[PDB]
Amino acid sequence: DTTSDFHTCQDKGGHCVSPKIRCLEEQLGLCPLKRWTCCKEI
């Protein structure tokens, strides 16, 4: 991508969390970094 235009993480569910964060509910989206999960609240 040249710009953020897609189904992101924080938008449909919750914010992007680094692969060591308390996930209340894990969901699917786009986070630009690493193994960052889209977590619906922490």
Dist. CA 2–CA 15, nearest whole Å: 21
Please name the residues in contact with 33: beta carbons below 8 A apart, sequence gap of 6 or more: 16, 18
Provide DSSP, 1-42: --S--S-BSTTTS-EEE-TTS--SSEE--B-SSSS-EEES--
The burial class, CB within 10 Å (0-12 / 13-18 / 19+), for 13 is middle
Report d(CA 26, CA 39) in Å as an integer. Answer: 5
Phi, psi of 40 (to 5 degrees): -75, 90
Per the structure block, which two tokens stand in for 42? Answer: 């922490």
Measured distance CA(2)–CA(25) in Å, rounded? 29
Residue 22's domain spans which residues? 1-42
Within 8 A by CB and 6+ apart from 20, the residues are none
Q: How many structural domains are present in the chain?
A: 1
Burial of 15 (0-12, 13-18, 19+ CB in 10 A): middle
